[PDB]
A paper describes a structure:
Gene-targeted assembly was used to mine a novel salicylaldehyde dehydrogenase from an Alpine soil metagenome. As a key intermediate in the breakdown of some aromatic PAHs, salicylaldehyde can be oxidized to salicylate by the activity of salicylaldehyde dehydrogenase (SALD; EC 1.2.1.65), which is an NAD(P)+-dependent enzyme. SALD belongs to the superfamily of NAD(P)+-dependent aldehyde dehydrogenases (ALDHs). Generally, the enzymes of this superfamily catalyse the oxidation of a broad range of aldehydes to their corresponding carboxylic acids, playing a major role in detoxification.
The crystals grew in the orthorhombic space group C2221, with unit-cell parameters a = 116.8, b = 121.7, c = 318.0 Å, and diffracted to 1.9 Å resolution. Polypeptide chains A and C formed the first dimer, while chains B and D formed the second homodimer. SALDAP adopts the standard conformation of the ALDH superfamily. The monomer shows that the enzyme is a classical aldehyde dehydrogenase showing the typical α/β aldehyde dehydrogenase superfamily organization with three domains: catalytic, NAD+-binding and bridging domains. The biological unit (dimer) of SALDAP is formed by the oligomerization of two monomers through the bridging domain. The oligomerization domain is typical of that found in class 3 ALDHs, with the C-terminal portion of the protein pointing away from a position that favours the interaction of a dimer–dimer interface (tetramer), thus only favouring the formation of a dimer. Although the EDs were good, protocatechuic acid (PCA) was chosen as the ligand bound to the active site for refinement as it fitted the ED better. A hydrogen bond between the para-hydroxyl group of the ligand and the Asp427 side chain is indicated as a black broken line in Fig. 3(a). Interestingly, the binding of a carboxylic acid in the active site of the aldehyde dehydro­genase indicates the potential for product inhibition of the enzyme during aldehyde oxidation; this also means that the enzyme may possess carboxylic acid reductase activity. Although an NAD+ molecule was not found in the cofactor-binding site, the potential residues implicated in the interaction with NAD+ adopted a fold quite similar to those observed in other NAD+-dependent ALDH complex structures.
Author numbering:
A (entry chain C), B (entry chain A): 5 to 470
Write the structure that this text describes.
Amino acid sequence: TVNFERINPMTNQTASTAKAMTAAEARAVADRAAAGFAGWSVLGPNARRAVLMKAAAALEARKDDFVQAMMAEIGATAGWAMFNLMLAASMIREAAALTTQIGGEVIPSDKPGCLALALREPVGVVLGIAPWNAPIILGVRAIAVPLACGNAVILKASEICPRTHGLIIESFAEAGFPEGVVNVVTNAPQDAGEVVGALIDHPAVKRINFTGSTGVGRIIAKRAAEHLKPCLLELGGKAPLVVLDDADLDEAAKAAAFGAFMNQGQICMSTERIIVVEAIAAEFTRRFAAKAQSMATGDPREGKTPLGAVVDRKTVDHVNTLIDDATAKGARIIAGGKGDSVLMSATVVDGVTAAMKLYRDESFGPIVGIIRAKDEADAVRLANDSEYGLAAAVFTRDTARGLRVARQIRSGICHINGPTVHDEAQMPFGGVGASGYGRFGGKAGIDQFTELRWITMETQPGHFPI
Amino acid sequence: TVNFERINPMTNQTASTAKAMTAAEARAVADRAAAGFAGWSVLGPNARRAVLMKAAAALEARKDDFVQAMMAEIGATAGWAMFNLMLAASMIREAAALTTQIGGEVIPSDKPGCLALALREPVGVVLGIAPWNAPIILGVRAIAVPLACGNAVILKASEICPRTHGLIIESFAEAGFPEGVVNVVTNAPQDAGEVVGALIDHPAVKRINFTGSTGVGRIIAKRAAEHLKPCLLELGGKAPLVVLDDADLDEAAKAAAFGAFMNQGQICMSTERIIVVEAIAAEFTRRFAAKAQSMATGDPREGKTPLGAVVDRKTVDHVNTLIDDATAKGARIIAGGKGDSVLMSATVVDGVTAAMKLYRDESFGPIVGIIRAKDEADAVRLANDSEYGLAAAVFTRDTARGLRVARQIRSGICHINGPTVHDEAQMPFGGVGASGYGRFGGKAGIDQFTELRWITMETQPGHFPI
């Protein structure tokens, strides 16, 4: 009996503990999922919908356990935890709504009398690896539509929030899924490679969805290639927000502040780079600096400030390194600055250049860089000067120009006059380049967790050339 | 100036020669494709359709060069070459028909006034690696829908039929595509790893489609994972045809003979395993043996027989080994037999068991093994006793039972009362397991060669929580 612990970042005392599973124990979880698949996969759409609706209600019934777990494990505000619970429950109800919408197509054939079908069928066991930053939302995203598609699931819980992720599986356990359909795997950080490797290698595991860093994503894709397993990879992001000469500067500053500092900038689509054309750069910067200065940081347990704590000291040191590298290379701090605790200030760095680590590196903290563009063509080039391509935004009162710019930006997501932080269960969500491939949400999500099969039936005798 | 050659399997003289490109020359082809992409990607659907229709007519205009090239390079009959030409031209016209059908979706949003789009956009350069067995069909499949989707393409030609594949690109060159939109890469077999590796690593190459062996597919998938590139992998298989107790035995024997021996069994979906329930095994075997015995092999240049030559001596030695092995372990030879030349007989081995090499092996030659099943449940287990899962077929007069069996067979394709050999451009085509993932054809094919983007436009001011 071996456990690992998660230390509370606000108190430095144990927040929670969980089983440090071995590769053998993780394989036995996949064997239980493999055995539960057959029964669950043949259940009708209304019966499947009814179980998923019970899971959403059971998730909402564990509200007190979820708020305590998120606040203790990741240093979240009670508001961020309630937002997580609310939206996670809505995503389960969207997955329940989709069961009668997962079907197929009838395609006309040139073979006389041939009835030809393209059917979307359940695959088997889906492995869902979820991160800690929006833990209920992303733990639920890793398994909801996979379950609605008739698959058994393994939620590979984050070592940063094992209780928050464990509570998702305990909520689903009250809904009445058959035995072995919903499962959890927990592991110590040092065993991640061997435990995740053993699950990817397991013959019953047919689809892998992973949300996390590009570096770990590439390791997962290489391990999956060894057994020809398809992956849905939601990786890093360095979201740019472009401000053109006719942008509503008040609206751009409000959208940029919300996108840069929501959840202390710990979101895959947080605003990392603000690219402003020279014509309005001084005015935008003044408005944005004043807005970032008005957003206070405070103890998340008090619930009185827009910003709470970052996940741990590693983020504090990484953000401080990015600030020191930037200012040593000529950049200027125009809001916030370096911090000595997890209660970090909303920081704005002006004069960010290609020589600085902050221009390219994913900060995952409450820091944003302002980059100067000469004109629209230069702003597009700067927005595209990144290996990443998850979310992006463009601000302009000429929305037709916003569409021309969005078409040139290389990203999976682009919001015209909206913040970079935005997601809805019915929308396809994913990246290009180093941000990965595949999409969660809507019809694209269904395609990721079903097997498309060409099934035909003859109604006449065949006419063979030989 | 370095060339490789292809030797004619019927005469043992040079059939053709082609440039043995280096990794540097292959990268320069990808640079030309990258530069041609922008212009081609913004062309309207009717203008793109008109160019593709000219490509189909230019393909048909080079008929004499295609028939000579296929017969000389792979030992094909003029019939197999004309069939390849006819169907490849039809697939280009299907790709031309799809240009007005590649669009997007408008999805309702919970954000007031937000117009939300899910757009399928051109990706960039598509690398399409095509094999030699149905060289015009597969060479065209590797690029036709990728071109309709507004991408530039690189056809990575087979070293077994470099002139047949080179003629596809010369036909497309007559259609009026912009410069750098259609390209070819040729390489000596020993340079495949370095040339294909250099193209997969190239930043402009955004999608890879590969048709070939499982072993090479796994190498391609790992190389693609290093740069997070999505792949479409069609990796062949060991197609089972199941004959149940109420099957129309005459129809099953005709479909099995056509599927086992078309193109001398050198098709990814050729019938490799016939699984017969004991109730009708003796009668099916008699009918099938009589049918296989009536299918003669002859010199493909004479054009008087249903079977021509196998691609080379390697196949002859491999099929002879499968016969020696099976008959030494108690199998029965009921049609054909061993050969001393590329003109191989249509061979049928009965009483095949898991102790014989013919039970799991991909033969890619004119040989099929008959496996005895106790009943329907045993036949399903035997059909699924393979790492492969591309095509399969089930014969039964009870088509509802055919559907129940097809649902249990693990494959990307299943034909009820049809042969295992069947493809149509509008149908999704691909495998599961060791047969790969992704699908060519229909709407699934379009999704493989487009980038799905979530684009939104606000029509009201935002309401931000911070």
